[model samples]
Target: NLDIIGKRIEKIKQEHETSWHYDQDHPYKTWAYHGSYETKQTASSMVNGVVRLLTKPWDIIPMVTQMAMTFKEKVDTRTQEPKEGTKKLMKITAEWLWKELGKKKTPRMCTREEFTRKVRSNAALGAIFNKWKSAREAVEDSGFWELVDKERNLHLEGKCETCVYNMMSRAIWYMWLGARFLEFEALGFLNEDHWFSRENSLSGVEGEGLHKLGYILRDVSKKEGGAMYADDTAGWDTRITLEDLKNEEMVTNHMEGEHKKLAEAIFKLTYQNKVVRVQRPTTVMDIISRRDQRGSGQVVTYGLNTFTNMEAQLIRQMEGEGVFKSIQHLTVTEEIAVKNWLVRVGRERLSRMAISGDDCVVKPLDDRFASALTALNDMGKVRKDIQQWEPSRGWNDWTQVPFCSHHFHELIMKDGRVLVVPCRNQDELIGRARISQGAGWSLRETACLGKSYAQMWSLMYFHRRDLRLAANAICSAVPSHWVPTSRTTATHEWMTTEDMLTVWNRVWIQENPWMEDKTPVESWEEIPYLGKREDQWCGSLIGLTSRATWAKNIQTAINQVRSLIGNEEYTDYMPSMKRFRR
Candidate 1:
């Protein structure tokens, strides 16, 4: 299950570094060949000395107003963005001081006194790291462990009962996934392999370990494309739960300026990293923390306020702007009209095949095949006067026997009723009626014993195999909102009239769930994983991919047929087809 590609990981890391290039540069000194020691070792030793000097211990002072003034003046010459400004300010301050003091003279900025003052006051890079490290350690001792315990317990639970728990559950999955890579190890689980060592894992790597870990887990998966997970079944989705609804729902409450600061920091970091940054508060037990450094710091942080405010502002501003202002739009999925395509072809061939009367129509050579079509379509969509492939109209078992035909008529009743006009024998009267009349039709079901044209249409166009014809033809006709001609095309071979009067509607109720109070299940023992998590069944790799492909391809066939019908509808005699796209 664990496949670790060293090259792949390196490639991704390189891309991340490129996408998140830092603004600061580090100075390096190389060793000369004439050095007393080997060049590589000498260089290593020199690097060690520089690191020691840079990292030397120092005591912090209270705010240094004098140095801050000088720093601000130096920074004013550079950029204004927080991070870029910080780097520029630090560099300019160092350079400006260098120019103010001779290189030969001992530097005040680099002096022990000045360095100690800056370090304690968070004016130097090392001091900033130290402050960050302290806070991180404190969080590690408190927050992370709690997060792990909560998430793991939720994961093993069978179901997510409510919205909030569901989200926390998912977050737990992500948090656990991210934390699993960190050096912190849980006692019971199997250890990851050698390739998954702490140094290489998301959790183990230094810097923003948890942040990048979660990002990579989700981001790398996205590169695989399509849905990140195969989600189905009825259950509250977990994504919504990660938010703090109480805080969000309060009508009167607003982020007290301080929460804005944390939000700004997170949004900035996420922007630099190019990833989604949720603004939800990092929660612990019962206590809710305020936005800023408040009393005891036991309460939560309102870092999420920044993102919420930004999102609202952007949306409100864009509402006044036109559609052009909206940078994103959804892509529409394509659909195919399978029935229309088949019916159109059948109609077109009618001219060349010359199938109009009793003797000229095509018939199924197989009796069994015809009977199956009758059972599937309920013999409602075709005419019974048409001759069956077999000549057994008077036989006692004629109704149960199977039959087929080649040449069929598309017939429409005056009362908006659609049917296939069949060839009539003497016993079956060849009814004659003009299609233009708005109201004229009788009960013909008892006299006609023919199968629905849908079955024949499906067999002829969709599933060509005789074995599949019954199942295919019995299927539902694709929606016909676009092709007005198709409504008439199902009526008769070369249909010409539209009926607006009395109409009869037939709907198969057995297949619909809401139509019946309860459906029968053959056996409870036959059910597979009846109470499993949605991901357990729907999330299975093959199941999800196959379902998507099934939906996509079926729709594709439907669209292709509709386009074919569109061509037929635009003939000189036909009215212009309505534009399907809005």
Candidate 2:
């Protein structure tokens, strides 16, 4: 305030110069110009000092008018005559300078009291300022890092926040699988380490697995051929309609009792009531009915019996409860209703139980087991295919050996024992020997290295035997092309077709479970195959076959070679070679 007053006083001093000698034409009659005019400084100081002493000091001084004179007066003076302090001068320089500098200059800052009253006078600004004040005060005592850590932990784990929606979706998939496996066990199917197995000894010697039965709804959809066991279907449409739930007969008979029981059991654990609803194809379908429905057009309409909004709301509530970390979106469809409840139970309840060794029916096959299985299966296919090849004198010199012949080496054993191997040396063989001894290596690295697990497993499980059968028929049909090798025994020799058929039968019809006590044969001559007691064979090695099944053999070989070169196979029944480039 004092500085502002000083600034104004300084401006006044600068504008009107203090003369050393008193002016005779001074406007105000003062003593300094006449009687007491000693030194003009003394006189001027005395006069100005009286002016300063008499005036009341103030800040933000009030002034009036645009200027002391007008531009029209200046134009008039310029047009009329030259002025030498003329009495009739139309314009003054002081008025022009003051007018130029004095355009609407006003006080900007005010006291806090005045500002508060002004803000309170306007309702909108008053509300805004009041809220701002409350917010500022509330945060004034808050620790910055404390809130940061709180939010971080909340997003990371406390609230189960995740960057990906599919993470939760995948978790839901596993949860459904786990619960489904449990339901399978509950319905009296014996549990296996993996989900594929032989159902019975006399069941046409047929094999079945999760691919054929996993997605089939046991409770919602009934079976065909009037059989007791349900048949697997393709479509995943199992919507529970309002009519289905409301009708006692449909609930008891139409709907699969076991499916509902399994669902209810899962829901009982989740502590949420199962909510179901019926939906049709379109909004018009919601109003249309089965009796009155008439559509001759190409559009096919099925009355979809799905869950209701309550079911989605229930899952959302559970999602907020941290039952699952996140949700992709909402739906009350049949697939969703089943999966949501199943996922909640499996992820929130059963996953813990399984990890803690409480849920023992299902054995989880992680990548470790999967890798071991691949090594064994691939090794098996290569070994069996190589055994069919008989060594001639110049067999090694033949560059055009059978498909994938490079992957295996023949093991000639003394004491009338022989075996085919899948590695160049013991170091190359898979399992604990190689897996355990590498310098900076892990087990799966040794087991599944340079091998496509999916490729080898699919070939072995799906097409190996069929190709073998075709190759055997071709070899047998043309003996000149594929000559049979003699089993050189000291005692005697066996039948040609009979011995080959015996070996083929053992491979095709038997379940060769993983052998634990197997070791690699270091020397070719020391390898063992004594009688029917060859338990050390790892498994069939893939991509090794005679020229008869060259088509199938080359197919898998290309897949194998592509995998080794870091190319992926397309996800289809008949996979195409897919290469990746930078």
Candidate 3:
């Protein structure tokens, strides 16, 4: 799992140094590097040394003061709108400094007093500055800077005095720690294979252990093309906890766990270096001690008041404690993703393939299929003759020998099996099948039937798998809320319709603690991950006692269908069931 690209690390580090090294002729070396006070101070000295050599004696102090004021003005411009006069002054002064110090190559300014003032004044920057300051002082006060600088200068071979300056600039403190930590193992000086000593499996390495380890580790997992080393060092952690990576919720809860683990790992490794009679670098110990003294769970951060995953965890925990209010869990997961995908894509594909026009008006070749249609057509005459024939109720429960169709074949297999097919219009053939489920002479129960055209069509469309004789018959024979028309396309409005069953369970069923009062397990179970958190679940005792809420929803749809047929008032059905306006 740990495939250390030892060869490439050094090459990248060289490239980083080449691109970021301090400019000696530049007026302010402090403006470029981010390491603790001393690393920045060193760069400052190099630049100041050069400027003083070419500059006049009396001009020196006033020039430095002018540079500082200019730096302050530039920062102010970014923080707020700058006055036109201030902007002109900034431009003129920056150019003048460039010409005086850097041979007019580019504009650069440095004022340590002003920079530190701004950093301390801002809450976010103050925290970041202090953390880096502590980390830097820990190394600088321990006298490790001499050894680190010696190692870096040797690598440069004195070709450029400032070549090694890049190593301690940019993310200066992080780079310093990463480099020194590797060296403290008594790993031979730069260009040696000592950095890879712990992982001995790899052999025959050229250009190995060439990087400042601290710098590489700090940036290894960052996403692409961001500012160089912008993250707080406290956010760095090397421990790999794979289980915590699997679930989103777990990862959120353990936001800083990995960073803490890495800090501990570093401490342990540093301790090992000491016992082995290797250079322990008291600086690493100093940093650890300072960090400990600040209190546990405390971290130094940078930038604006940004919310990390830790904030998310705190908010979720507070909700559990009912700090503001308890909320229902509605997080979308894999199950919901797949379910929504099917309804969104599958429904559209199926609706586009339905049969309509004269193709839907099937002629029954046999009496079995024809008989049901005949009975349906004779309903009006029978009703007129027998005025006492009341409106039929509970047609779905009729369990008498089921009458089935044989002749009408919209979707029949070549092997003499009758199959129902999707159609645009519900004709006499469909009416015949529906009549079989009603009173009077019906088709045989074994006969294939298509009772609900809208429902069957929806199923046929979903499976990837009619002319209207009467308006009432079309409404009753089709699925609930489906309006049949000659238009080339059918729209699916049902997908967005609320899942009332789940809603009822959340509002009322789950609120009732007793097994005799709650919603059915089967209904609630369809809801994903509802009761996984035991404390978050509604009540202790569990077991569904009733499912009337869902059952009523089903009945409401039935009434909606009947209402379209004029047998019931349209408004009498639930709002979700009412399709056409009066």
Candidate 4:
């Protein structure tokens, strides 16, 4: 873009006549435009003329660092051209002379590309840029506004991009130094077994430990820099082992034709299934014997026949209390009113149903409904000890499987005691009860957590002798502190000892139809509550059972909806059941 020297006066005027307030803070077009010097008339008029020949009137700004400095005081943008020797000319020359002076400098080699990337990622660079924008906005919005005038001083003084790059460079240098130190510290955990060589200190710290460390040791590990190291190669082996991962597949469908169905039918639904009577301890041992005879020997025969006996004894008590009639009125309905009543009478009914599914019956309504409602409300708040079925999250070991029979278990326990391990919450009770049940063993002799593990020897030995009295009494005896005599209810107003007993023993209808359909298993030990199958991995079983239970709840919800609204026409009227999915 060429411009005329002397001829530019009129054109320059035309171009910028309307523009004003040009200052040092402003930007100019080019170096030549900002390179203007004062005209001299002394003896160097020729040089001045040459300057005038090459430069144009439009090029009147100061050249500062390859950019134009168009400050009001610095620029000599006068309308008049060089009237060769004037005060204005002298002043311009002096100012330009002062600006031309330079200071000492050291040179460094670098590339602009490197500078750009470093500056782009710098946090401090961002902060300073923000400050610059804020100050400029404030100045333009209000001329030296009193409140923000002081803030303008915060504007960055040095080259922002350069400053950011230098600071970031310093930080990165230190981080690299620290990385060596961390690598040295973690070097001890590495070995030939790992992917990392001994020299590669960053290795056991990977796979599992590294996975956990990735989040924890962000600063030292440089993981915070986001070098992603997560891998699923370790988890591949356990993929099928993980149940409940997909909510649908976790279940142990053992009681389908047993306890639950019986309760449902007795509650007056369309169907019922009775709980099989708790097998005697001898019967369970016999089953184990038979199983062993068939060549499917077990490690140790374990079961809930003990619980079954207790349940049966409790049922006998209920029969004495006339609880079967209370359970005879049991009912299940989708109606809100019916649910309310069921909650009231369900406790009493549940006790009876424990006897038989046929004993699961309940009335449509009853005189004792008020008391039942109060009791149910109180019962609802009882801190449940129902975590037995909750799946545990832990690794399995060989001991997870139970021994086949007492005779076989005795041979296996030649060097050790037969361990009767319970679920998590029941561990302490199991220990204490084992000591109490053992004919000769005492908890005072055992280890802390394993306080009563030795009781099996005495119980087994005593059976060989005729000391049934002492053995049976010791085994069945509960601590006085645990046993209740004349108990009082803290929440229920009318729940006396007798009423509580009645509630516990309430008898209900029960039915058992032999299902010719055998859910095939290697043995009956597959049953969850019956055989107490020890070989079953708890988490897998629990996950399966939980998923099945959830499915059942969903199905129950569907049935409840059908029973409640009955017809699809009522969908528009009922807001609550509108979202129900079939």
lDDT (CA) for every model shown?
A: 0.20, 0.21, 0.23, 0.20
Clashes of 4: 46
Reference-based TM-score of each model: 0.14, 0.18, 0.14, 0.12
Per-residue lDDT of candidate 2, residues 1-582 (tens digit):
222123223332333344223234432221011111122110010111111111111111122111111211211111111222211110121122122222322112122233234333321111111122432332233342244334334322212111110001001111111222222222211111111122221011113221211111121112111112111111111112222122211111212434444323322221111111112122100100110111110000111111111122222223323333312322335334434444444222211111100001111111121112211111111112223222111112111122111222233345333223222111112111111211432322322221222222222222222222222222222222222221110001111333332332233223222222233333212323222212113232323343224434433434443343243322222222111111
Q: Using lDDT as the measure, which candidate wins?
A: 3
The predictions' CA RMSDs to the true structure, in order, are 36.5, 42.0, 37.1, 44.6
Better of 1 and 2 by TM-score: 2
Candidate 1 TM-score over all chains jointly: 0.14
Instruction: Give the number of the best model, judged by TM-score.
Output: 2
lDDT for 203 (candidate 4): 16
Using TM-score as the yardstick, the better of models 3 and 4 is 3
RMSD of 1: 36.5
Off by over 4 Å in 4: 1-429, 437-516, 523-582
When summed lDDT is taken over every stretch of 10 residues in candidate 4, the lowest stretch is: 288-297
TM-score of 3: 0.14
Q: For model 4, what is the alpha-carbon lDDT of residue 273? A: 9
